């Protein structure tokens, strides 16, 4: 799991300073290993950045997908998926920030062409994740557990809203897992159940 | 309204290229006036950026505040305010992007100290706007038109969600005002009424 520890540290370093100003030294500092070991596993700073994005998307899919196939109505499955999405965002916040840095710099003139192409290619992971939510929203409309709404718009809205927790959420030293689930549950109650 | 036209164009230019790579020439191109006229009204690119942020916040407050004091329950007023917020976002999208660029670069090491201080000072406009929504959410809980929830968390969530329309929304050449209100209304129905 040396590679995984490097990615964990890189996620936090990129979140702190952004891709441009983050350096390998910053990451070697965060992970507490040498530049030599980092370069054994990775070719460049940008290679680490892409790997963080990919791993972040892997981790959230692996956490959320089981809830999409468990027994439940569309509403029940959507609620469980959404709570899992937010628990992942809150507990793997650096990975979340790096995914969205990647999306933002997908067209950065500061990058080489191959680098923009690599970030654009990762959009497919995000699109496939969104398809999973859109299917469940469609199913919840069909089983009557969700209000009849535009499936695509509901999907884009829900995912934008879940991710928008990143506007105000920050990690807290002593915050417990049970407490992160409570907070995630409070937000999802508002997103799915509404304010009215 | 020469000054207003410059701000309109600057908002669109900053939205297109960001603060760093936007230039006065870009703005003079967008507005279709000379650099001389722009410098008559403004001292620098950063001065224009601050003015766009301020004007964006002025415009949204002036549109939304009347709905906060019209007759209605907390739910009714919150719905009207939220629709107005989204109509403003969709119709004044460049101003919205500049406000959030300002918030993001509030701590940019690329800026002089005075520039970060000026952007931090503008946070007060955003805080005062949020207070108006938090009051109405509290009132809707008190009049029973909204579900009992944490007022602060509901406020941060709702505003984050309304703004998160910017993830997917783009201006469309022939999009009508009546159609923008319809789309805004569809989103707000989901935000306030929920998906369930
Ligand atoms: N929060 C994520 C992991 O950190 C990153 O952003 B997102 O947004 C919706 C996309 O469909 C998948 O990518 O959800 C997972
Ligand atoms: N969309 C705005 C105007 O463009 C910009 O962002 B915001 O977010 C919530 C803040 O309380 C006020 O600032 O709402 C208004």
Author numbering:
A (entry chain A), B (entry chain A): 10 to 205
Task: Show me the paper's own sentences about this structure.
Recently, DarR, a 201 residue, TFR regulator of a putative MDR transporter, Ms5347, in Mycobacteria was discovered and represents the focus of this work. Structures of TFR proteins reveal that they share a two-domain architecture with an N-terminal DNA-binding domain and a C-terminal inducer binding/dimerization domain. The DarR N-terminal domain consists of helices 1-3 and the dimer domain is comprised of helices α4-α9.
The M. baixiangningiae DarR structure was solved by selenomethionine single wavelength anomalous diffraction (SAD) and refined to final Rwork/Rfree values of 18.5%/20.2% to 1.6 Å. In addition to Arg135, there are numerous DarR residues that contact the ligand, including Met66, His94, Asn97, His105, Val108, His109, Tyr138, Leu168 and Asn172. By contrast, the HTH distance observed in the M. baixiangningiae DarR is significantly larger, 50 Å, indicative of an induced state. Consistent with this, the M. baixiangningiae DarR structure was shown to contain a bound ligand inducer. First, the shift of residues in the loop towards the dimer interface leads to a pendulum-like movement of the DNA binding domain as a unit, which leads to the large increase in the distance between DNA binding domains. Second, the structural changes in residues 117-122 prevent the formation of the cross contacts between the central subunits of the dimers in the DNA bound state, which we demonstrated is essential for the dimer-of-dimer binding mechanism.
